[PDB]
């Protein structure tokens, strides 16, 4: 009964609303409890572009303030590293289940009707301005 | 150390080659940040509402090299069923560890009933909602051993029967 929502985390994806100087909130996706987000890191096939031009990120889960400001510091948790844009196997894939209850003590829990936020920074920089960002809305029970 | 690694889940590059049965809705790969804020791959299940869970997870083939006696170190978090609302008839606080000896490097399907049970593994410290709130890991470490082994290698498996459990790491070694 679950379903998965794919999120291609890169600047060319118009759902982030980048390239304009105003993403107006960034990426917005609506999910249900026990649904998944599959996040695909930027990926490049042969012939590879110059190494410096490959998008690479650290993804953070943050509060609203972190989301508004694109600054994760003291505002959230490091979640995932998009550090292999030329991975031979394909795009690095990271999944987030919107579970009620976590089996991992440092994992995360979700509730109907609530909002959750993720942002990226480009190492070695702590903050991207403008950053790519994601708001997830978990539907109310119904 | 005097301990020689035969398999370590944390060192594995990229994705773990492990087979989950069922393939979806049971054990599921989850990437987290470890001790040192670096990434590791974990398997996790929490079907504490629905009855008759029989969720299997099997490693790849592990060579024993020349060792007869091998040790299986499992690090995991396990949720206290009293920290979970509405699941008293169903929630469990143990899982079962199995092994299977094999000369065959690459069996695609291993039948669940070929596996020999090692032990039921319980947690010394089950974690609660205070721990989730306070970001306190309550990491459990459990070690079991198998041997004397007599084939080229073996498979290990983990059977969940309705617990809320995260397998953070698995290390298989022999003693010097
Ligand atoms: C940036 O994101 C876009 C999607 O917005 C990626 O394009 C998709 O790539 C997948 C897997 O390779 C394909 O199945 C889809 O057909 C593509 N979708 C669309 C709408 O074009 C693109 O690969 C990403 N770019 C980088 C460099 O990672």
């Amino acid at each position: 009964n679950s379903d998965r929502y794919a999120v291609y985390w890169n600047r060319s994806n118009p759902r982030f609303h980048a390239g304009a100087g105003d993403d107006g909130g960034g990426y917005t996706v609506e999910v249900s409890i026990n649904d998944y987000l599959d996040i695909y890191c930027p990926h490049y096939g042969a012939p590879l572009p110059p190494a410096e031009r490959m998008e690479h990120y650290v993804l953070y889960m943050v509060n609203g303030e972190g989301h508004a400001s694109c600054d994760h510091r003291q505002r959230g948790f490091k979640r995932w590293e998009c550090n292999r844009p030329a991975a031979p196997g394909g795009p690095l894939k990271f999944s987030e289940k919107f579970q009620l209850f976590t089996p991992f003590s440092l994992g995360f829990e979700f509730r109907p009707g609530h909002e959750y936020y993720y942002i990226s920074a480009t190492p070695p920089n702590a903050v991207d301005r403008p950053c790519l960002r994601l708001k997830v809305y978990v539907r109310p029970t119904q | 150390t005097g301990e020689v690694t035969l398999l370590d889940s944390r060192s594995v590059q990229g994705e773990l080659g492990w087979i989950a049965s069922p393939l979806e809705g049971g054990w599921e790969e989850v990437s987290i940040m470890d001790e040192k804020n670096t990434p590791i791959r974990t398997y996790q299940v929490c079907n504490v509402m629905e009855p008759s869970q029989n969720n299997w997870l099997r490693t790849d083939w592990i060579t024993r090299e020349g060792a007869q006696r091998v040790y299986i170190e499992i690090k995991f978090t396990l949720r206290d069923c009293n920290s979970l609302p509405g699941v008293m008839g169903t929630c469990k606080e143990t899982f079962n560890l199995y092994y299977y000896e094999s000369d065959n490097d690459k069996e695609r399907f291993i039948r669940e009933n070929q596996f020999v049970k090692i032990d039921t593994i319980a947690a010394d410290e089950s974690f609660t909602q205070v721990d989730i709130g306070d970001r306190i890991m309550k990491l459990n470490t459990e070690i079991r051993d198998v041997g004397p082994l007599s084939k080229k290698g073996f498979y290990l498996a983990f059977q969940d029967v309705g617990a809320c459990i995260a397998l953070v790491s698995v290390r298989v070694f022999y003693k010097r």
Side-chain angles (χ1 to χ4, degrees), chain B residues 12-64:
Chain B
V12 148
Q13 309 309 139
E15 203 191 304
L16 292 168
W18 298 12
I19 301 298
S21 177
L23 286 157
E24 301 158 54
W27 291 103
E28 283 182 344
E29 205 155 25
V30 185
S31 181
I32 63 170
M33 289 298 143
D34 70 2
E35 309 291 343
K36 314 130 62 210
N37 223 27
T38 227
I40 61 185
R41 300 236 149 203
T42 74
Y43 278 94
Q44 306 187 10
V45 63
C46 191
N47 292 350
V48 294
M49 280 159 289
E50 326 95 87
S52 309
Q53 297 300 310
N54 185 27
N55 302 311
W56 282 71
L57 176 66
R58 196 255 273 162
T59 70
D60 290 321
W61 183 81
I62 309 166
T63 179
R64 77 179 175 96

Side-chain angles (χ1 to χ4, degrees), chain A residues 117-141:
Chain A
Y117 316 92
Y118 308 77
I119 63 174
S120 58
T122 301
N125 311 284
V127 184
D128 287 349
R129 305 184 174 99
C131 79
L132 295 172
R133 58 192 170 181
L134 179 64
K135 187 201 285 211
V136 180
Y137 171 63
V138 183
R139 291 186 204 86
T141 291

Side-chain angles (χ1 to χ4, degrees), chain A residues 18-111:
Chain A
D22 212 349
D23 75 2
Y27 198 128
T28 286
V29 64
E30 188 166 333
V31 307
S32 285
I33 287 297
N34 296 334
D35 284 353
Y36 298 77
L37 221 65
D38 293 318
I39 295 178
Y40 302 84
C41 295
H43 189 261
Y44 305 89
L48 289 169
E52 311 94 65
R53 269 101 150 194
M54 293 181 302
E55 299 171 56
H56 61 282
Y57 302 109
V58 173
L59 306 196
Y60 294 94
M61 180 181 201
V62 294
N63 61 18
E65 297 69 22
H67 182 265
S69 74
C70 278
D71 188 340
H72 82 87
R73 294 169 298 182
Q74 302 174 348
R75 300 220 187 79
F77 306 98
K78 181 180 178 182
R79 294 300 301 282
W80 305 290
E81 296 182 9
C82 290
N83 59 2
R84 314 224 167 288
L92 284 183
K93 185 192 181 186
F94 295 109
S95 294
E96 175 77 306
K97 184 184 179 189
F98 297 105
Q99 65 206 346
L100 278 180
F101 306 121
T102 182
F104 181 48
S105 47
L106 275 49
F108 297 89
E109 293 191 340
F110 302 85
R111 298 286 173 276

